[PDB]
Write a protein that binds this ligand. Sequence first.
Ligand SMILES: Nc1ncnc2c1ncn2[C@@H]1O[C@H](COP(=O)(O)OP(=O)(O)OP(=O)(O)O)[C@@H](O)[C@H]1O
Ligand SMILES: Nc1ncnc2c1ncn2[C@@H]1O[C@H](COP(=O)(O)OP(=O)(O)O)[C@@H](O)[C@H]1O
Ligand SMILES: [Mg+2]
Ligand SMILES: [Mg+2]
Lengths: 236, 110, 485, 122, 121, 470, 64, 65
Amino acid sequence: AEQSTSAEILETGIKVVDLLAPYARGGKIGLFGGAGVGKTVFIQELINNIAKAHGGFSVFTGVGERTREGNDLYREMKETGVINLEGESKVALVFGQMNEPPGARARVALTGLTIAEYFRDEEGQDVLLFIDNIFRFTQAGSEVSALLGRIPSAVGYQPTLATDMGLLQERITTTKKGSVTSVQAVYVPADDLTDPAPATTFAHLDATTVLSRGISELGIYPAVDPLDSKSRLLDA
Amino acid sequence: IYGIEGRYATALYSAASKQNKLEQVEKELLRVGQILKEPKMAASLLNPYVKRSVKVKSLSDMTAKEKFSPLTSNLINLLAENGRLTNTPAVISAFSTMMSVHRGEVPCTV
Amino acid sequence: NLNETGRVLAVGDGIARVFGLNNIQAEELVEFSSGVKGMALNLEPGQVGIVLFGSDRLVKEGELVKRTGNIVDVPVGPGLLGRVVDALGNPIDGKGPIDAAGRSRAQVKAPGILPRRSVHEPVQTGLKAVDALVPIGRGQRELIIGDRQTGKTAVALDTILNQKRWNNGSDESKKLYCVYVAVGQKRSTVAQLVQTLEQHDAMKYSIIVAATASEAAPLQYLAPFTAASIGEWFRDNGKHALIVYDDLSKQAVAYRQLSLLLRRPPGREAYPGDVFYLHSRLLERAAKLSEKEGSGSLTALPVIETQGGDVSAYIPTNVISITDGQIFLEAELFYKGIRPAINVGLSVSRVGSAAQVKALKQVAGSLKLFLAQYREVAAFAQFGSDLDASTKQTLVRGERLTQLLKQNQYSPLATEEQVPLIYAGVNGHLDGIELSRIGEFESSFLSYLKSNHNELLTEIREKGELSKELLASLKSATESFVATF
Amino acid sequence: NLNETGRVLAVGDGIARVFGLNNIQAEELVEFSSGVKGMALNLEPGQVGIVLFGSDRLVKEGELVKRTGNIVDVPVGPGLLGRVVDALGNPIDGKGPIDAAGRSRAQVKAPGILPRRSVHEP
Amino acid sequence: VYDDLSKQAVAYRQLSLLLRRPPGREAYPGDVFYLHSRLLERAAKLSEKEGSGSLTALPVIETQGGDVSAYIPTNVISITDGQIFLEAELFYKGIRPAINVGLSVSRVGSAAQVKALKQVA
Amino acid sequence: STPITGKVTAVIGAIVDVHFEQSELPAILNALEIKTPQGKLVLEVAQHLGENTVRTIAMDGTEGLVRGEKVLDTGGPISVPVGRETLGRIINVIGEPIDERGPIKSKLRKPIHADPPSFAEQSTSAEILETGIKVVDLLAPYARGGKIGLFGGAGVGKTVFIQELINNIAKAHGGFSVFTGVGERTREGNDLYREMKETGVINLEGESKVALVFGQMNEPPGARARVALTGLTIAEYFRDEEGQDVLLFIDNIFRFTQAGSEVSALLGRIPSAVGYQPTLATDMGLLQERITTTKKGSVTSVQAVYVPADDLTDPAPATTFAHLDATTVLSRGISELGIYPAVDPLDSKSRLLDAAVVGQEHYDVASKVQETLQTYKSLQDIIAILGMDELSEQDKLTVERARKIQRFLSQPFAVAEVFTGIPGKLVRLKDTVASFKAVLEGKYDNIPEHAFYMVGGIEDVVAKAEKLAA
Amino acid sequence: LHRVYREVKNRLDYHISVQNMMRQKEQEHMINWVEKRVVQSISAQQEKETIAKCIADLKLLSKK
Amino acid sequence: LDPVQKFVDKIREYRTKRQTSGGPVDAGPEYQQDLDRELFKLKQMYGKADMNTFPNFTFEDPKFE
Ligand SMILES: Nc1ncnc2c1ncn2[C@@H]1O[C@H](COP(=O)(O)OP(=O)(O)OP(=O)(O)O)[C@@H](O)[C@H]1O
Ligand SMILES: Nc1ncnc2c1ncn2[C@@H]1O[C@H](COP(=O)(O)OP(=O)(O)O)[C@@H](O)[C@H]1O
Ligand SMILES: [Mg+2]
Ligand SMILES: [Mg+2]
């Protein structure tokens, strides 16, 4: 009953976005492409824009984040201005190192989700939740369910996989008070989309912003690929 | 009677003797014998379907509602720890002979 | 006692389950009546599962076992340099007792988010195809993945040898102590590997942690962590240490063995869920400490052996996901002659130029381009001369640029000697030279500079950069030699 | 008493856990009260695992079991020529008893390394 | 002539599983190899002292989808003195019997073949 | 005497459980004995289940064991005969004579189980070993006192290969040799024993220079898993105590893992990936470590490895590579072409494949041959899709040569003379290198390819090419 | 020069390695000797069968 | 446990051993044998010279290639 009865577009601040693959308000967006395409640069952007257009804060969540990258990220964010120590920050950071046990890894996401829901139900803002990467979240579960003794499903993943995915994606939605838009990266295991983990993830994704090397190679910034970027809200 | 199996009771009641629970350990041990004769028990005291630490819990039900609990609330888990609930009746018999040697092995000055 | 001691209930498969020790710690060492030691990994309410470091022939039933009150610890410090120790840290070379400056726990927590710095100190491997294409950085985790007999060890091995250029110097923040971790390798191999470093005077700054295949599984389990601490010492004290895990593949197999025998849940390919937590908790230990922490640094070069190029396997996928780049090697490329066979196409480095000498960066930025277009137009080389001139030009370069990367083993070159070769290659001063004489070209060219243009080489070695003056002076010296050739 | 006999504890799927038989050999033939014969493959203190050569709808808990004392063997010799027998070597063609010359076991050791000749006969 | 050991292993697999004996690969008992090894080795040529007697064996196996890389088949290919591979595809082409020479070999070779026929081919 | 009595309590396949008395339990890896009317069924301690119960592994047929037979503790691991007394005699796993020559009079009896030599004892050598096989001596030459591996699927040529090596090294070796048949055709042994008499290596009424240990496939999982150790122990003796060169021939070494793989399930071991047992790396390890050269004596080892389903990614083969200095991989894809021994020139490598070992000239010639055969295989997609005419002048000239060298690698063995009909030919390394060198320079671009197929020395190529022209 | 060093140091290190080996060995037989004198203490001393029922009945209790 | 403490019994036996001066306590001919064996491995490791003595040196002439 608290769910909305209509999907609306969420103005980001990028032509390549609003015109081609627009972000769904309270939907799930898939971000492809690793370092080299300025992934980090494309993230801090969405945090600024929305902070000025919708004035909604952002929450970054790192599951099995590389301690190396976590450092350079934090530092970069202070150089861009998305995070000011003396002034006012706009985004909260919640990293989950890789050297941590599966237990913690599989909960990092929920930790960041909680903080985000606060500004949705309390302050009613269009908060953005960033998850990198939704893949290690499934892997985390797989190691946990593995140790517990639970029998391995198809491909080795956990049987409970189906329910877990929903205990995170469903919580990210637009309510009557506020809304939470998820911008989580996606990793394709062995360049195969038949695999359960990806298959299950895409079932919630509403849009996908791909970042190709060949796009940034032509001097096009951001490296967003117009052909690959698609949205489920691209209708009259 | 043999020794190793008979020592089990004597190595458990040994502490019992110091207290004088031979009655609570000898009378209890008698229970373990009837439990083995119970056809329904044979399907529980030797069922590999339960577990190694699970079946031990269900024992408490036959340890707190049969006679055990004190000098038998240890020998119970030990009797079902490795799976010696097949020839355990022989261990109880030794108790009757070892329980009589404790009466003489005491400073009889009074 | 029953609290500090225990009785062996059952023994086998190099794992004995003991009863007692109600106060024993997790992963704590213990000592049996016979003398063989072990560590308890499983702590059950009734019994305690303990792995063995020696034959299970020594351990019997009912045997007595006592605590050690100490977790797996290994002695660290500069005394190890030039020695050869086992997983535990005992001498096996026969050079006497070791002189350590302290001990460190096998299990150490990686440096936090804050106490680190963006890698910026290059790790010259002395490999042209590496330092030019895939640059490695002090604190980086570069993975040497490849099939059997491809040249994985060659990469690391040359790297170590290429360190005599700084370790015999005076400055410390420039040196680099090398820690090799032999896992699952026969003794004969180690004895040779060691004997090679000596004939090159490299043992002077190398630490060998041998973990032969005949040794108990747990030894092969603790080896990487043991050696990990040893190098961290250097890192903590404000220095530089290079550690090469050769190979992690064997380690996982060992660990799998213990886990299965202990009856822990089996996952993909019979690997327990904590197998990833194993390597992630190992590689993350190496990094680049900040200025406040000591500016110290620990580089990691883990080795993974694939089965027919299958990088999609479980173990490899784990490792590749954690590291920060790969030096993929293919047997095929090896057969053609391209040695070391480093697949430029796959080999990548996330840090890149951040950790590469600007002297070489100025001539390498373009070298990745030509090679890139060469792999695309490589099929055309098989067809008649009917190829247009445009594409043909690419083939002329590629053939020669690929021929230059071919570097003999045990023959590392300093940056001062790399730049001149890359600069002549990129511009295309070799295109006129036959593709058969490219080898001798390097020889006669280097000897030329070191007798007529020695002043140029030495300026590149010290400055580390190429000014407009040098770029012109280097070009003039090249065109002169190519002319007289 | 139970040295040469035993009582069935469970039975199903052609398997029968009989209790007793503490002098039966490994892979020894046995006979139940029903008439159906069986083979002992698993020797354990508690019970003995036996496999049935026939249907198991005839064996029931608490049934008597007897032993053969001999390893499962089959009749051998020229007599069999032209006859059609079953595993055990009994006639199934219906042409009289099997006139065998000797009886040899099922499991026989392979011929020696010494007593061999290189194959030359087509 | 055994026809076929492929079924025999399935049978022997059934006793194992039912006797609650742990399976190896594809449920077959660990010693499944030892099932055919101690069978085929029983056939061989005896010494002149023994009687010059002999026993020849023609084991038969049933592959699935032409997959000779299977568990049981590989176990037997390793023991037998060669194999007469038969392909379905050659059968239709009109090669009958469809013996694939490319894969069919005899380890005894010409030693066993007739001397006359040995010359002409 | 004061022996320890015992009693069998369980019998499942090749796994026998004995129940001893308190304080009387034998350590792991101890032998046992059970008196039978026929013979003796030795057992080997494996685990200690507890409650004075031990689980052993039947060294022979388990049929005929009665619930509760009294077992006699040997008091120590399986003892095998050692010394020159075992020369010229056939021995099984238990160390009993099986050649009908009466008892083996040995002064000592050393256990089959022992620890691997110390890292300090390890001695590295760089000497080369001349066999006589072109494709080997030119590409991957074997090292004196080194470990050799002959990989290959079923029916590739691993046996004939290792057999020739014996026909060219064993006689030509002034020392002792040990052959160990593990999990193979009993008939192959027979032929072997026959040839050793006919060659003169083994003399029944004279001296011998080789011992024979067989534990073929007809034997139960217990035997095939320890027969490798039985023969190793006899070799090792000549290594340290005799202090002299020794040739160890193992065939096949894959049965060592397999055999253990069968019983691992029954010993309550959770099957590892691919079905193999978890203890693969260690077991395969504790065997190869012992097979090595120490400062006391030199041991040249020739172990043939089996490749299940022609798959090299299989753990068993995969693990074995690291314990080898010289690897000679055999490809079935090479057999089918008719070229034998089906040796893969690219995949086969060696330790002595160094300029500073085989010579500078030797390395260059070897490298050229490899590069030629590689480009050939690289153009295989053009020679069928565009023909030979489309290839460039440099390509066609190379391709022709690659085809000549390829066929030039084939060599007739005196052992497989019954297969090829052509008399064996042994080529010397000094001439081998000189042959390809000449062919690489194009000095024989006129001679026909069929003149290089199944030919020994280079002289024979020219002789053959001339005999065909007639 | 290097050779003189290696060789002398080598002679020196020998003494340490030896010394070290002796210590280890001895302290093996030393702590192991403990075993056989304690298996003699319980097996013998019938008054070390009283210190049996003792410490052990102090198990049942605590746990609960 | 408190009874578990009553360490005492171990010390006493440590004490009697340590109080013994006449080689390694309760010899057994094996000790020497093992000793000698390990004493031999170290010879292998460290070389065949008299380690009680200062070393001789005859140096190699230089070598030219
Ligand atoms: N750069 C090189 N130049 C010439 N030869 C090389 C080079 N690198 C490796 N080799 C050759 O490679 C062989 C060993 O290769 P290498 O040890 O590098 O592979 P690896 O990764 O160790 O494989 P494995 O896992 O079997 O040890 C040697 O025989 C040597 O001749
Ligand atoms: N030199 C050779 N020339 C041609 N064929 C050979 C040669 N050596 C072996 N073979 C073939 O290989 C077969 C024997 O294979 P074998 O050596 O037993 O291989 P595997 O080791 O795989 O069992 C022979 O029948 C023969 O046809
Ligand atoms: Mg290597
Ligand atoms: Mg063979």
